[PDB]
Each structure stands twice: as C-alpha cells, then as structure tokens.
Amino acid sequence: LKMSFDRLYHDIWKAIEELADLARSYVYNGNIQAYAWYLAIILLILVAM
Amino acid sequence: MLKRVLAILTILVIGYWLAQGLADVPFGQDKMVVGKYYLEHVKEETGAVNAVTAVVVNYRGLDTLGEVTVLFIASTGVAALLWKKKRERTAKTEGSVVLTTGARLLFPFIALFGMYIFIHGHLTPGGGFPGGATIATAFLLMYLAFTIYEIPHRGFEVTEGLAGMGYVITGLIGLAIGGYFLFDWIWQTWGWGHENIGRLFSGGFIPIIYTLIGIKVGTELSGIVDNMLKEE
Amino acid sequence: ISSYYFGAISLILIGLYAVLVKKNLLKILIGLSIMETGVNLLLISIGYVSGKSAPILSEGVTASNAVDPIPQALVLTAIVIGVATTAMALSVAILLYEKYGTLNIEEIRR
Amino acid sequence: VNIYLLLIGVATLLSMYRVFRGPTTVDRLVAVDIMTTITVGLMVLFALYYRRIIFLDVALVYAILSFAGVIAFARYLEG
Amino acid sequence: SQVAALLIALPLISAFFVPVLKQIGKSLIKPFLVIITLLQTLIASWAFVQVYSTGKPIIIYAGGWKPPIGINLYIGHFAALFILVIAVVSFLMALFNFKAVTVEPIDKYAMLFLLLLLGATGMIATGDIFNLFVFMEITAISAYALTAYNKTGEAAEASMKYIVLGGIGSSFFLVGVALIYGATGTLNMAHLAMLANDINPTVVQVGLALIIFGLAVEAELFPLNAWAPDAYQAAPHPITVMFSAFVVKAGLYAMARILYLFKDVSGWSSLTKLLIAMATLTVVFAELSALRQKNVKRMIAYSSIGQVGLIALALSLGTQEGVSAGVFHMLNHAIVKTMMFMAIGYVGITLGGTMIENFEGLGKRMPLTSLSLTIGGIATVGVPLFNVFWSKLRIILAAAHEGNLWPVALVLFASVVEAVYYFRLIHTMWFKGKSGERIPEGAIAIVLLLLAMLIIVIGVYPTPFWNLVTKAGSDIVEVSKYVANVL
Amino acid sequence: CIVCIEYIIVALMIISAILAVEWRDLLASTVGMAAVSLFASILFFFLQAPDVAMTEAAIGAALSAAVFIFAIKRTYRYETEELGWWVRW
C-alpha cells in the first residue's frame, strides 16, 4: 500500500500543469524580437522546403 | 556577437532562397499573359491615354477604394489614439522670421501645383495621391512655420468624408446601370462624353474622380500631422 | 543576377535584419518602413521588358511599347499602405513613451 | 547625352563620404540635402536620355519634397 | 445580379457619412451604427437567399470588364453564408456597444468598427489576389487602431507587437504576390489556377510558401499568434468579439482558399504537411497556456486561438469529408465565442475588470448571464448533444485518411486540457459565491439568451444546417466547377 | 554609361540601408530613411515608371521621413545605452 496510483496520476497531472506554466512564459514573451525570431525561424523552415 | 552573426547567416540563406527563386526570367519580354489587354485596349475603352490611371480606378476599380479606406482608417486611427480635449502646441520656440514669411508666400505656390497634379492624370503621370500628398505638404509648411496654425477641425474632416462619399456616389449612381460603367463618357447622363482623346474635354470619367480623391487624400495627412502635433 | 533584383531583395533583407537584432522601438519601425520600401521596389522590378519604354505617353510613343501596366497599379496602393501603417504605428510609439517610462523592448513590462 | 550621366554618378558617390563618416549630427543632414538637388539635376537629364516630355513632371515634384523634409529635419533641432 | 454588390458599398458610404454627422450633434452617433448594420443584415439576407435559391453564385463584376482582366467578387455558397453570419454578429455587437464602451471617444469609434465590417465583406468575397491583399490590409489597420483604443499602457503595447508583426507579414505577402505574378503574369484566381500547373516548379514553391506565410501572420497559428492573446485581453469589449468571431475566419479561409487553388504543383504537399504541423502546434500551446491563467479574459483568449487551430487542421488536410466540415466549425465557433466575450464583457462593465477575484461569485449574484457563460463553456469541449461536439467530431474524423493519429492526439489532447480550465472556472462562479448582491442586468438577459437558444437548436438539428455546408464546401473542394462558374 | 550608374545607385541604396540601422541617433536614422527614399525614387524613375517615382517622392521624402522625426520630437533622441554602479542590470 506504499505504492498507490492516486499519487502517480497527481504527479503526472502536476507535471503537465507546471509544463502549462512553462510554455506560457517561454513561447509567449513580451519581447517583440522574440516573435520576430519565431517568424524568421519558420521562414527558415520554408527555405528548407 | 552571437545574435548579429547568426542573423546574418539566416538572412543570407533567405536572400539566397529568394535569388534562386528569382530565376523566372532575366528581365525578358514574355510576361504579359493578361497585361497586353491592359495596354492594347486603354485608348478606346476608358478614354485616359494614361496607362495606370485607367487600370487602377476603372479596371481594378475596388483598389483605389480600399486605398482610400486605408488612408481614412489611418486618419481615424491616429485621431482615436490621440484625444485629450486640450490639444496645445509644444513650446513653439519661434526661431526664424525668413522661415514663417518663407513658407507664407510659398504656401499658395504649392497649393496651385498640387491641384495641377491630381487634375492631370491624362498626359502627366501620377494620379490623385502625389498631388494630395503635396497638398498635405503645403499644409505642413504652414504648420511647421507658424506658432499655431490650427485649421478648424469642426468643418475639416467633413470635406474628407464628403470627398470619399463623392467617390462612392459615383459608384452608387454608377449603379443606375451595371457595376461601374463610368456614368460619364459612354452615356450623356449629366453632360457630354468622348470628345476626342487628348486633353480635349477631359477625356472620359477619370479626371473628376481624381479631383475628388485628391481632395480626400489632400485633407488626409494634414489631419494626421495636426492631431500628432498636439501636446497637453 | 541583375542589380534591381539583388537591390530590392537586399532592401527587404536589411529591413528584415532591423527587426530581429535591434532593440530600440523606433529603430524597429525604421526597419518596417525600409522593408516596405524594398517591397514596392521589387513590385516594380518584375515587369521590365528591357527595351520599349513609355508607360504614360500613348500620344508621341506608339502603343504596345509601354512597360508593365499591371504592377504600376499594384504599387500605387502598396506604397501609401506603408505610410498609413507607419503613421498608425507611430501613434503607438508615442503612447508607449507617454504611458510607460521608456522605449526599449526588454524594459516594457506590463 | 551619355557622358554627363556617369559624371553625376561620380558626384553622388563622392558625396557619400559625408553621410558615412562625419561625427556631428547635422553633417549627415547637409549630406542628404545636397544629394537631392544633384539627383533632381539627374532627373532632368534623363528627359534627354529617354526623349520623353513627361519625365520633367517628376523632377519639380521632387524639387518640392526635399525642401519640406530639410525644414522638418532642421526644425526639431531648434524647436 | 450586381444589385447585391452593396455588401461593400453600403458599409463604405455609411462609414463616410459618420464623420459627416459627428459635428451635427452627439445624439445620433451611436444609434447611426445599429440601423446600418441592420441594413447590412438585410443586404446579406438578400444575397443569402439568392445564392441558395439556385446552384450558381453571383459573379459581382467590377464594371463592364469580364474577368480575368477585371475584379470579380465570386460570392459563392461560402461567401453568402459568412457575410450573413458576420452581419448578424455585427448587429449583435451594435446593440451591445451602445451602453458598454462609453468611457472613451466614441466620436470616431463607429467608423473604425464599420470599416472592419467593410474589410469583412471584402475579405470573404475577393477574387483578385490584389484585392485579397488590399482588403486584408484594411482589416489589419482596423485592428492596429482598435486594439490600441484604450490608451492605458498595457493596452498601448498590446497593439505594438501586432502592428510590427502585421507589417512584416503584409510585406512578405506582397513579395509572394510579386513572385506568383512573376511566373504567370496574371492575377485573377480564375485565370491563375488553370495556368499554375506548368508555370515553373521552382518559382511557384517559394511564392506559394511566402503567400501562405504572409497571409498567416494576420491570422494565428504558432509563431504569429501571441499578439492575439494580448489583443483580446486589452481592447474594447465589443471588438474582442468581432476579432475573435470574424478576423480569424477570414484569414483561415483565404489561406485555405488559395491553398486549394494550387492543388496540382510539387512542393505543395510539404506545405500542407507544414500547415498541419503548425496547426497541431497551436491547438496544444494556446489551449494549454490557459491552464495556469489568472485573467479570465485571457482564459478565453487562449481558448479562441485553440479552436481556430483545429479549423486549420481540417481546412488543409485533403479535399473533402472535413473541408466542408471545417466550414462547419467556422460558422459554429463564431456563435459560441460570441457568447463568451459577451459574458466577460458584461462582467467587466458591471463589476469592473476581469480578475478572478472580481469574477468570483456569480451564481446568485449575477443572473442567467452566468448561465450563458456556463452553456458556452460547456460547448467548447462539446460534451452534450451540442454543436461543437458535432463539429469537433467531424474534424477528428476528418483527420483519418491522411495525417492520422499524431495530428489527432494533440488537438484531441487539448480538449482534455480545455476540459480543465473551464471547470476550474464554472466551479468558482456557481458554487463558491457567498455573496447575494442582486445587481440587475436585464438588458441582455433576453438577447444573449436568444443567442443561447440558437446553440440549443443546432445542437439537436444539425441536418437542417449540415446540408448547407455540403453545397457550401463546393467553393473550396475543387477548381473546375469554380472556374467554369466564373468564365 | 548604362548599367554602371545603375550599379552605383543600387549600391548607394544598400550602403544607405545598412547605415540606416547601424546608427544610434534617431534623427540620423531619419536622415538615412530619407536617403533611402531618395535612391528608391531615383531607381523608380530609372526603371521607367514616373508615376511611382513622383508618388514615392511626395510620400517617402517628407511624409514618411518628415513624419518620423515629427514623432521623435516628443520622444527619445538616443538609443540611451549606458560607467555606472547599478548599470546593465
């Protein structure tokens, strides 16, 4: 009974929920030049065809 | 040094991609698949011997309309972004007197000439937009060489909307028959039409639409620099 | 390659380069206006037939000898598109220094 | 009809030295203001080169729009 | 008939008559907007019942010049439907903004709104690629001026990144137009698709890639999106609807129009395999960034991006069984996102702000406006016999024959995440209240609810509405019956 | 000549483009923007389309460059990149 599954699913959901706080701050910045760099990266992928 | 050099690498591969993509033709002749119809049918289908004034107001007739929509939206956007009910000048810091008198006498010299540009879209190049922009330049010369020069706003943007309406009322009374149909040279609606072909009797329909659009874009940028030269 | 192709794509190149690496906001708007200028330069430099040339006379010059009557109508809007967009963005460039205290993209924190 | 053109190109890239170097804030301004008049004199010259009566109609319009620009550049410097 | 060409001219003449009556008084300024968009619903309904009367669209000419030398407004089976739904949504906005936005100079806001309606009926009626660009820039500068119209610092910067990103995208779009014209020489899409099979295989690739690119920037997928959950957070409350309802759909349609105009060339398959991947990358990031979200206007702003990403998922996958069902999401998510930004707008105008701390406790405190947010938030995961359930089932079944089980297990993953941040919101407004302040708001207690009864009737009767998008998929599925119904 | 002055104008436009973004003084950036509008107008005229040349003359010379310094009037003039105790933090 020391190895429950109630604990593991709360662990995996808290990991997804803190990844939700992770992707919020990384991709969605206040830096305008970050979005310019995102546009230049996807344009570079269009170069790569 | 990381960001600048890495940007130069990616922008070099962008420019190489466009230059490899620019392998269509080395400035050759074979380009007009529909463009020959614009040239060979411009002297008898509109009246304006000008090429560009007949294609952008008659042929691509909903594109100077989107253009004046864009300029009017720039006016109302800057006016909505700057609104304080006070609207005073900066410090006005006079500076010279051969400048105020310099732009005084020169103000009708550009007012005569800017009108000359948009009335003549027949043998002269251009259209309504360079003449309207230099009418706005004359407004700017009187606006950047005096201590106030506030043209009265209540009674200023009225004629801008009136000139845009004057474009669209030629589309709406143009809807008396068909889509556009010029209302002016092909049917004796208000006056005559198609006298000869050169600067005799103002060609077809294209001059009066350029007077109206030149009046609209003439009061366009002058309003923008007006409500952007206003402090608290 | 011809000089017009390279020069119109390098003006777009420099206007693009002045959006990524530069940090002051009005320098970014300078990059936007430069890139729009190079864009309408490319928009003209597509239809030059290397030869016969009088787009607007049609009186002293014979017809079927003018250059590219399609892109000259594409550029008559697409230039003043740029000055209307720049006049719109300049208002925001004024408001951002009025309401906040600076004009650098790393310091503007809402 | 032809030699003058290359002379004006020599003139304008020789005026380029003032906008590249020059430590002051206004030597660049005196660089651009003179660069417009030499290119106006270029723009009148090509009317001979292409034999067109309409190519002078852009030259005088550019003879206005230099002067408004250089007043506006040299008015914030005073106020 | 060209008598129905007033979908652009009537908003134009009224937006040029509203600065004529701005000095004639103050009374008939904001009531000038309601009667004109009611006339817009009338001229839309004329075209709507005339398009579905016969099997032929109205080839609204630009004068006495037959296409391709002129401009054609191919108001197809798609276009009359979308002009109708934008007319009815703008009429729902005009009877909303009469007493909800008067904080700021509405002296000039009316023309900005109506010019957005002009860009609306221009963008989903365009035939020329030039007119496509011009109407998109009308909508773009409309959005530049109207997401900035609060002047509060956080709202001033909210436009700035969008004006510089929409500037760079419109720039790239004109380069792509210059290259497609550089190979062919024609502009009208009728004469373009019959020609673009053997123009040049190495020139059409860069032009099509950059056209899809520069048309994507004003819309949203992954890179060029983060201005949008900055624009909905900081704008006037009625235009957050008209952006989230409309402007995403015009961009996603005109992207998916012109992509299905070149469906014969090489390199196109890698382009739609990128567009699948970026649409899946935006159903995950947008609808998972709303999980730890504090501002409730942002909590819906992220949700509206994730619903348009799955529209992009099926708008460019194949040809059928999902493009005609991808439209079934665009005419459906506009209504349910009209419901969302109504309730958030009414909270932000009644109580004040959109923080959860001043959003908490609306079960007993607020009337059935909170029930409208309830029945709206129920219909984004699509749990009961509702309409987003029907539509999202049509989109997930669309991602079967091509691009399967990875571009399913991310969009369908997001609806598991979107299941979380709604019932962390509906719970804290119905069963946490402890505050009985009656605060009567019976001015939208009927109008939003007749809208809320419009999603309950499509939820039980989809087959009176799913037969429309079968004949309204015929403008995007093919080229041959499209071209032959022009020339 | 024919093509040599074209190469001169286009390299002058490029060197006025690169040096339009390298400077920190924003009034100098308006100078560089005005010179770019100069060489664009000359290239429009040399590519034989006078309509766009005179329109860009009336737009980019003193309605795009003289609206920009018009905006830096009540704003910064430098980059303001800064010696110091609590600096570059």
Coordinates of C-alpha atoms in Angstrom, one line a residue, chain A residues 13 16-21 23-25 27-30 32 35-36 38-40 42-43 45-46 49, chain E residues 157 161 164-165 172 205 209-210 213 217 222-226 229 270 274 288-289 291-293 302 420:
Chain A
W13 CA -1.0 16.0 -13.9
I16 CA 1.5 18.7 -17.2
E17 CA 0.1 21.7 -15.2
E18 CA 3.6 23.1 -14.5
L19 CA 4.5 22.5 -18.1
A20 CA 1.5 24.6 -18.8
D21 CA 3.1 27.3 -16.7
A23 CA 5.0 27.0 -22.2
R24 CA 3.1 30.2 -21.1
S25 CA 6.3 32.0 -20.2
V27 CA 6.8 31.0 -26.1
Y28 CA 4.6 33.9 -25.1
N29 CA 7.0 36.7 -24.1
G30 CA 6.9 40.4 -24.0
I32 CA 8.8 41.7 -29.7
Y35 CA 8.3 36.9 -32.2
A36 CA 10.4 38.3 -35.0
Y38 CA 9.9 33.0 -34.4
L39 CA 8.9 34.4 -37.8
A40 CA 12.4 34.2 -39.1
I42 CA 9.5 29.4 -39.7
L43 CA 10.7 31.4 -42.7
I45 CA 11.9 26.2 -42.5
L46 CA 10.2 27.4 -45.6
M49 CA 11.3 23.1 -48.0
Chain E
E157 CA 1.7 47.8 -26.0
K161 CA 3.7 43.9 -31.4
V164 CA 5.1 45.4 -36.3
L165 CA 4.2 41.7 -37.0
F172 CA 6.1 39.1 -47.2
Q205 CA 7.1 26.9 -54.5
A209 CA 5.1 29.3 -49.4
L210 CA 5.6 33.0 -48.8
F213 CA 3.2 32.7 -44.8
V217 CA 0.7 36.3 -39.9
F222 CA 2.1 29.2 -33.8
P223 CA 4.7 32.0 -34.3
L224 CA 2.5 34.8 -35.3
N225 CA -0.2 34.4 -32.7
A226 CA 0.9 35.8 -29.4
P229 CA -3.9 36.7 -26.6
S270 CA 5.2 19.6 -47.9
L274 CA 3.9 22.0 -42.5
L288 CA -2.6 24.7 -22.6
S289 CA -1.3 28.2 -21.8
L291 CA -4.4 26.3 -17.7
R292 CA -2.5 28.4 -15.1
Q293 CA -4.2 31.6 -16.4
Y302 CA -6.3 31.4 -25.4
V420 CA -9.7 21.5 -17.1

